[PDB]
Structure 1
Amino acid sequence: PKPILYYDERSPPVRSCLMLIKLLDIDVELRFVNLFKGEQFQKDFLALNPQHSVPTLVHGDLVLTDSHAILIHLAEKFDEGGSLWPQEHAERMKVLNLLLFECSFLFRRDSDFMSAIVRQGFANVDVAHHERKLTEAYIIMERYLENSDFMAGPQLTLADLSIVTTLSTVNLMFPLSQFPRLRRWFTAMQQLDAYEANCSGLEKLRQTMESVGSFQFPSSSAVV
């Protein structure tokens, strides 16, 4: 039975799942949930996922409500024995650790910045505060990449897919000029065919945020 993905492509964690789906050529039914219209509070969706969040995957009787679980599940099912979710324990733990960095640190900070803009309007956000928090994330990722060309090791893993969608979102606002390894990695990611799955949603998010927040991102910032 084909997996069903409830999605809003503006969302970075949704885009990571879209990227994996494209990378592994997985047949998935897409069901759109417009977050800015509050459709995630529809009684049926709420009953499916009380966290009212996307992505949400329905695959048979399995209901997953977090991009990182979805990434791992899809890797184990459509890339069984593969290197995206490595077979060797230490390597798999490294990937898991970076998936969790994306959730706990990078996404948390980007979400709190972007959500502030949605709630308060850009002109009323302490942008310098968020610049510091997100620059700190850039410095961390630069440190990770000083040892390897991918986030969790020498090969592409789920961690790269998870991190690149949020990094691309942070970089709508904050430039990467001071971060040579991060620039190299991001450019490499942009060369993947799977990266196309990031584009529509990133641009939609850009346009949506500028509308709701009443501002423009500096065009010079985004690496393209």
Structure 2
Amino acid sequence: PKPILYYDERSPPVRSCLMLIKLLDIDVELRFVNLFKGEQFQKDFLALNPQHSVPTLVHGDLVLTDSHAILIHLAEKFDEGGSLWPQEHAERMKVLNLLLFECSFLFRRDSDFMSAIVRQGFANVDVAHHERKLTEAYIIMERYLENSDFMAGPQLTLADLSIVTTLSTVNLMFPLSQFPRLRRWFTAMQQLDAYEANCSGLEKLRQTMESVGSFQFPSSSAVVT
């Protein structure tokens, strides 16, 4: 049967999956789970995914609870033999390594910062601490892009779809003026038709965070086309 995606588009990993669904023209059913209202702790959703997280994909009997497994599964089923999840082993391992960087380093640090805002209120967050941790991720991505125009090589892959949504989220707060390769890449990603799937959720997240955290992001930071 048709895949079912439990989602809140404020989440950057959710947006990565929405971008791949648009890019590959996949017919999915969308089921909203409001993360800021705690709907992910509702009994039936917890029974399905005890990690209480989105995105969650139900595809037949398969239940996936991590965006990077959802991206790989959808590429294997709906882009078989394609270049997003490369056929050659070394290229595939490079993409996998960059998906794991997104999980373990870029997303972890952005989640630490945004969670602190929700918990503590922006005015009580140690913003300079988080700026250092997230600038460090910008420096690493700039060094990846000094070698190729995409994150994992000369072609668009799943790694770019995973990284661009969290990068756009970090860039609500922290500017990219000192990172010319990351600016060129982000601009290129924003010209993809599939990047439209990032836009609503990024704006919803901006508004929600400003409301819960009682602050404004600096409008000058976000790179816009």
Q: Deviations over 1:77-104 (max 9, x none)?
A: 0000000000000000000000000000
Whole-angstrom CA distance in 1 between matches of 2:27 and 2:42? 26
Distance in 1 (CA, whole Å) between partners of 2:107 and 2:131 is 14
* Deviation of 1:65 (Å): 0.1
Which residues of 2 match residues 46-57 of structure 1 at below 5 A? 46-57=46-57
Residue 189 of structure 1: how far off its partner (Å) = 0.1
Q: Deviations over 1:138-171 (max 9, x none)?
A: 0000000000000000000000000000000000
After TM superposition, the runs of 4+ consecutive aligned structure 1 residues lying more than 4 A away are none
Q: CA deviation at 1:202?
A: 0.1
Quote the Cα distance in structure 2 between the aligned partners of 1:98 and 1:143: 13
2-side partners of 1:76 and 1:82: how far apart? 8
> Deviation string for 1:159-186 (max 9, x for gaps)?
0000000000000000000000000000
Secondary structure of the 1:173 match is coil
**Matched pairs, number:** 224
CA shift digits 1:13-32 (9 cap, x unpaired): 00000000000000000000
Gaps (5+ residues) in structure 2? Answer: none
Matches of 1:195 and 1:29, distance apart in 2: 20
Q: Secondary structure at the match of 1:221?
A: coil
The normalised TM-score by structure 1 is 1.00
How far residue 221 of structure 1 moved from its aligned partner, in angstroms, is 0.2
Cα shift readout 1:100-126 (whole Å, capped 9, x = no counterpart) = 000000000000000000000000000
After TM superposition, give the deviation of residue 72 of structure 1 in Å: 0.1
Offset of residue 212 of structure 1: 0.2
Unaligned 5+ residue runs, structure 1? none
1:15 aligns to 2:15 (yes or no): yes
Residue-by-residue CA offset, 1:30-89 (whole Å, 9 max, x unaligned): 000000000000100000000000000000000000000000000000000000000000
SS of corresponding position for 1:5: strand
Q: Indicate the residue corresponding to 1:36 in structure 2.
A: 36
State the match for 2:102 in structure 1.
Answer: 102
Q: Does 1:113 align with 2:113?
A: yes
Cross-structure match for 1:186: 186
**What is the rounded CA distance, in whole Å, between the counterparts of 1:129 and 1:9 in structure 2?**
27
Aligned-pair identity in percent equals 100
Structure 2 CA distance for aligned equivalents of residues 43 and 153 of structure 1: 43
How far apart in 1 are the matches of 2:209 and 2:109? 16
1:193 Cα deviation after fit: 0.2
Secondary structure at the aligned position of 2:172 is classed as helix
CA distance in 2, matches of 1:199, 1:213: 21
Alpha-carbon offset, residue 128 of structure 1? 0.2
Q: 2:2 & 2:16 partners in 1: Cα distance?
A: 19
How far 1:132 sits from its partner (Å)? 0.2
RMSD, aligned α-carbons: 0.2
Structure-1 separation of matches of 2:43 and 2:82: 38
